Amino acid sequence: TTSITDLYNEVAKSDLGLVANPLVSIIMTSHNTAQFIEASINSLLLQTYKNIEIIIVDDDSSDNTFEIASRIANTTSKVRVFRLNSNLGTYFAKNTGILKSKGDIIFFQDSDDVCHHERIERCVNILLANKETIAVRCAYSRLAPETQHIIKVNNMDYRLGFITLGMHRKVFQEIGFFNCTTKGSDDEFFHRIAKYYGKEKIKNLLLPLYYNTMRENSLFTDMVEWIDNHNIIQKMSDTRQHYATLFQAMHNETASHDFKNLFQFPRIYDALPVPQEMSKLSNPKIPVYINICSIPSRIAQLRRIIGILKNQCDHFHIYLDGYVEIPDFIKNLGNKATVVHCKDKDNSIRDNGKFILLEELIEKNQDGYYITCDDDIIYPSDYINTMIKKLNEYDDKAVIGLHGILFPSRSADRLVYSFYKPLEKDKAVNVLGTGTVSFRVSLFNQFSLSDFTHSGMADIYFSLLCKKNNILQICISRPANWLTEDNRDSNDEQQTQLIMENGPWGYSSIYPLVKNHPKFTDLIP
Ligand SMILES: O=c1ccn([C@@H]2O[C@H](COP(=O)(O)OP(=O)(O)O)[C@@H](O)[C@H]2O)c(=O)[nH]1
Ligand SMILES: O=c1ccn([C@@H]2O[C@H](COP(=O)(O)OP(=O)(O)O)[C@@H](O)[C@H]2O)c(=O)[nH]1
Ligand SMILES: [Cl-]
Ligand SMILES: [Cl-]
Ligand SMILES: [Cl-]
Ligand SMILES: [Mn+2]
Ligand SMILES: [Mn+2]
Ligand code: NA
C-alpha cells in the first residue's frame, strides 16, 4: 503493498471536516534532521489553512538543522526559529515553542515527517464544530522514505496518533505543559486532557493525514518489532510501561487544579520520578540560587526575568536599589525570595549585590549552584538547564559564563565575546560578565564581601577571586541571540587601575590551569 497515493485518494473521497479563521500555531521540534526538515516545513507552508505560523525549536542539533531552518525563517513571517543550547528532549522543545507561539489553536509536527496539505483545515473544522470541544486528533501512517509504501503498524494502514493533536491554547494554562521527558509524554498529556475535560471533548478525525517517516534509532524504535518489509509490531517497552502505569496513577491521585503547577514550564527537576533514560533535565543534586540586582528604571524587564526563572531555581536573592516599595510580583514569590530593599542610593553597593548570598552560603557551609543575573538580559527557557549541564561537563571544577573578555598577555586590544553574539566552541577567558555566570559554591573555602571594595566593576573583582583561587573562567558555546538585550533606552580610572595591579593576564594567566587537565585542553586555542 500500500502507498501514500492510496491514502491521498481516501482523503479526497471523504468530506469530513470540509465545512472567522483563527491563527493556528504548528510547533516543530528538531534534533539532527537536516535531511528531512525542509520537507517537513514545506508540507506546512503548502497547507490549505492559510492563517498559520510555524514555530521551530531545535534541540541543540550538532548537524546543520538549525542553519537550514534559520535560512527558511528569514524568507517568511510564517516561520520563526529558536534554538535550545543543550539537548533537553522533544517535549522541552515543544514547551519552548508554545511560549513563543501566538495562535489560539496549537498543532504539532515533528521535523522528520510530512503531512497532507488539508490536515489543519480538516482538523480545525472538526475542532470548532462543537464549542464545548477542547481538542482534535487525526490518524497517521508510517512510511518507508525510499519507496513511499505504508509500513503497517499492528496490521493497519493508519491509526490515531498523538502528534496529530490540535487543541485550544487555553489547555496549557489550565492543566500545564508537556512533561519534560524524552519519550511518552504525549500519551501522558493526552490522558491529562481527557481527565480534566472529559474524553468526549476529544474529537477524532479518522483519516490518514500525517505521514511518519520510518528511520532507524528514532525515539519510537524502543517499541518496534519487525516482521517483514511491510509490517511491524508496536509494543511498549519496560521503561515505557513503568511510565504509563506511573502517570495513570498520578492522574487519579493528583488534584486537577494542581496539574497547572505540577507541570509548569520552564523547569529543572523532573515532575515525575523517571530513570535517567527518560529525562535529560539537569536534575541538580544541590540547590540552585539565582542572584539578581535591579533598579526601578527597569521594572518592566525585572518582571519578565522573574517569570521565566521562577521555576528554574530553588531560591532567589533580590537586591532592589531605589525601589519605592517591593513590587507585587517579588513578594508573591514569598520564601523563594530573600529580598534586600535599599531605598537610600547612598547605602548602595549596586552590582556587588549578586555576591551577598555567596558569603552566607560559604559561612554556613551550604552548597549550591550560584547563578548571577542582570536586569537587562532576556534569559531563554533552557538557560538554567544549559548552564548546570555545561558546569557538569567540566565536573563542576570551573566557572562558566557567556559574556567573555580575553586580554593580551603583554584598551581596544581586548577580544570581547558578547553574550548575545555566537561562539562555536567553549573558550577560556579572563573576565566573565556577572550577568551571565554560574558555578558551584564548594569551589571556594572562604569569602568575604568586604574584599569587593568599589562598586560598578563586579566583573573584574570576580576574576581576581577566580585567579587567586586557581579557578578557570570558561566562555561556553551558544547560538546567536540565545540571550538578548532589553536596554530599552536605559571615566574608568579605577577600572584600569585594578587590572594592572593584579597581573598577569592573557594566555599566561589561563595556561597554568589548562596545563595537565585533559578536559580543559581545548579551551585555550
Ligand atoms: O533529543 C531529541 C530527540 C528527538 N527530537 C525530535 O523529536 C521528534 C520526534 O522524534 P523521533 O523522530 O525520534 O520520533 P519517532 O519517529 O521515533 O516517533 C523529531 O522531530 C526529532 O528531531 C528532539 O527534538 N530532541
Ligand atoms: O545603581 C545601580 C545601577 C545598576 N545596578 C545593577 O547593575 C547590574 C548591571 O547594570 P548595567 O546593565 O548598567 O551594567 P553593564 O552591563 O553596563 O556592565 C544590574 O543588576 C543593575 O540592576 C544596581 O544594582 N544599581
Ligand atoms: Cl535562539
Ligand atoms: Cl515519544
Ligand atoms: Cl523549584
Ligand atoms: Mn519521527
Ligand atoms: Mn547591562
Ligand atoms: Na520569520
For position 326, which CATH number holds? 3.90.550.60
C-alpha of 198 from chain center: 30
Residue 285: burial class (beta carbons within 10 Å; 0-12, 13-18, 19+): exposed
**Beta bridge partners of residue 294, listed in sequence order:** 320
Q: What dihedral do alpha carbons 204, 207, 208, 212 form, nearest 10°? A: -10
DSSP state of 172: H
Pocket test for ligand 2, best of 292, 299, 350, 455 (most atoms within 8 A of CB): 350
- How far CA 169 is from CA of 56, 119, 175, 245, 409, in Å, comes to 17, 18, 11, 28, 55
Distance CA 29, CA 218 (A): 14
Q: Are residues 244 and 296 in the same domain?
A: no
**Top mutation candidate among 26, 27, 28, 29 for ligand 1, by most atoms within 8 Å of CB:** 29
Angle at CA of residue 270, ends 267 and 275, nearest 5°: 145
Write down how long the chain is.
525
Q: Say what angle helices 458-468 and 493-501 make with each other, to 10 degrees.
A: 10
Q: Which of 194, 229, 253 is the last residue of a domain?
A: 253
All three cell numbers of 12, joined, read 479526497
CA 513/CA 525 separation, integer angstroms: 13
Give me the residues paired with residue 428 across strands.
474
Tell me the sheet residues that pair with 208.
139
Residue ranges of the binding site:
29, 31, 59, 111-113, 142, 215, 218-220, 280, 293, 298, 321, 374-376
Confirm if 267 and 281 have CB atoms less than 8 A apart.
Answer: yes
**Helix, strand, or coil here: 57?**
strand
Half-sphere exposure of residue 483: CA atoms within 13 angstroms, side-chain side: 29
| CA gyration radius, the chain | 26
Position 274 in a domain: no
Q: What is the CATH number of the domain that holds 123?
A: 3.90.550.10
Closest among 396, 92, 101 to 267, alpha carbons compared: 92
Q: Please report how many Cα atoms fall inside a 13 Å half-sphere around the Cα of residue 486, on the Cβ side.
A: 16
Which triple of cell numbers denotes residue 187?
A: 500519551
Determine the Cα–Cα distance for residues 127 and 133; give it in Å rounded to an integer. 6
Annotated binding site for Mn(2+): 112-113, 376
Q: What is the resolution of this structure in A?
A: 2.8
Whether 241 and 320 share a structural domain: no
Q: Mark the residues whose beta carbon lies below 5 A from ion ligand 6.
A: 110, 112
| One-letter-per-residue 3-state SS of 251-320 | HHHCCCCCHHHHCCCCCCCCCCCCCHHHCCCCCCCCCEEEEEEECHHHHHHHHHHHHHHCCCCCEEEEEE
In sequence order, what are the beta bridge partners of 140? 159, 210
For residue 263, give Cα distances in angstroms to 132, 187, 266, 272, 411.
Answer: 24, 15, 9, 9, 49
**Same domain flag for 249 and 295:** no
Which atom of ligand 2 is nearest the CA belonging to 490? 13
**C-alpha span between 297 and 302 (Å, rounded):** 10
Asked whether residue 483 is domain-assigned, the answer is yes
Neighbours of 413 (CB within 10 A): 7
Report which DSSP code applies to 417. Answer: E
Structural domain count of the chain: 2
Asked if residue 276 belongs to a domain, the reply is no
Instruction: Answer yes or no: is 112 within a domain.
Output: yes
Q: 442: Cβ–Cβ under 8 A, 6 or more apart, which residues? A: 367, 396
**Could you report how far apart the first and last alpha carbons of the chain are, in Å?**
56
The verdict on 358 and 445 lying in the same domain is yes
By DSSP bridging, strand 24-30 and strand 105-108 are parallel
CA 8, 13, 14: angle at the middle one, nearest 5?
A: 100
Residue 339 lies in a domain: yes
Cis? peptide before 525, omega within 30° of 0: no
Rounded CA separation 261/270 (Å): 13
| Buried/exposed 223-251: b ≥16 CB within 10 Å, e otherwise | ebeeeeeeebeeeeeeebeebeebbeebb
* Alpha helices, H only, 111-199: 119-128, 170-175, 185-197
Residues 123 and 210 in one domain: yes
Ligand 1 atom closest to Cα of residue 88: 1
121 CB under 6 A from ligand 2?
A: no
Which set of grid coordinates corresponds to residue 239? Answer: 521503561
Are residues 356 and 220 located together in one domain of the fold? no
Cell of 463: 576574576
- Residues 6 or more apart whose CB falls under 8 angstroms from that of 111 comprise 28, 29, 30, 31, 33, 36, 37, 40, 56, 65
Cα separation of 268 and 353, whole Å? 25
What's the domain range around 384?
Answer: 288-410+412-490+492-520
The answer for residues whose C-beta is within 8 angstroms of residue 208's C-beta and 6 or more apart is: 7, 10, 11, 116, 138, 139, 140, 141, 157, 158
Write the burial class of residue 308 (CB in 10 Å: 0-12 exposed, 13-18 middle, 19+ buried). Answer: middle
Cβ neighbour number for residue 500 with a 10 Å cutoff = 9
Judge if 327 and 432 occupy the same domain: yes
Report yes or no on 269 lying in a domain: no
Nearest CA to ligand 2 atom 12: 376
- Cα–Cα distances (Å) from 22 to 137, 138, 170, 257, 416, in that order, read 18, 19, 14, 28, 45
Contacts of residues 503-511 at CB distance under 8 Å and 24 or more positions apart, as own/partner, are 504/409, 505/407, 505/408, 505/409, 505/430, 506/406, 506/407, 506/408, 506/409, 506/410, 506/430, 507/409, 508/409, 509/409, 509/430, 509/467, 510/428, 510/429, 510/430, 510/472
Q: Which 3 state secondary structure label does DSSP give 157?
A: coil
- Quick check: 54 and 80 in contact, CB under 8 A? yes
Distance CA 31, CA 416 (A): 30
Same domain, 50 and 187: yes
Let me know if 506 is exposed, middle or buried by CB neighbors in 10 A (0-12, 13-18, 19+). middle
Distance CA 371, CA 366 (A): 15
Which is nearest to 37 in space by CA: 100, 109, 121?
109
In this structure, are 245 and 299 located in the same domain? no
HSE-up of residue 220 (Cα within 13 Å, Cβ side): 19
Centre a 10 Å sphere on the Cβ of residue 33 and count the other Cβ atoms it contains: 25
- Residue whose Cα lies nearest atom 22 of ligand 2: it is 294
The C-alpha atoms of residue 20 and residue 34 are separated, in whole angstroms, by 36
CA distance readout (Å), 206 to 17, 127, 139, 214, 354: 11, 13, 6, 21, 56
Among 226, 253, 280, the domain-final residue is 253
Other C-beta atoms within 10 Å of 156: how many? Answer: 11
Within a domain: 259 = no
- Residue 265 in domain: no
The number of beta carbons lying within 10 Å of the beta carbon of residue 375 is 23
H or E element that contains 335: none
Same domain, 304 and 216: no
Q: Which one of 197, 232, 253 terminates a domain?
A: 253
Asked if 168 and 293 sit in the same domain, the reply is no
Please give the C-alpha separations between residue 376 and each of 165, 296, 315, 432, 516, in angstroms, as whole numbers.
37, 12, 20, 16, 38
Q: How many CB atoms lie within 10 A of CB 212?
A: 21
Going through 302-383 in order, the beta strands assigned E by DSSP cover 315-321, 337-342, 369-373, 377-378
**Residue 338 and residue 227 share a domain:** no
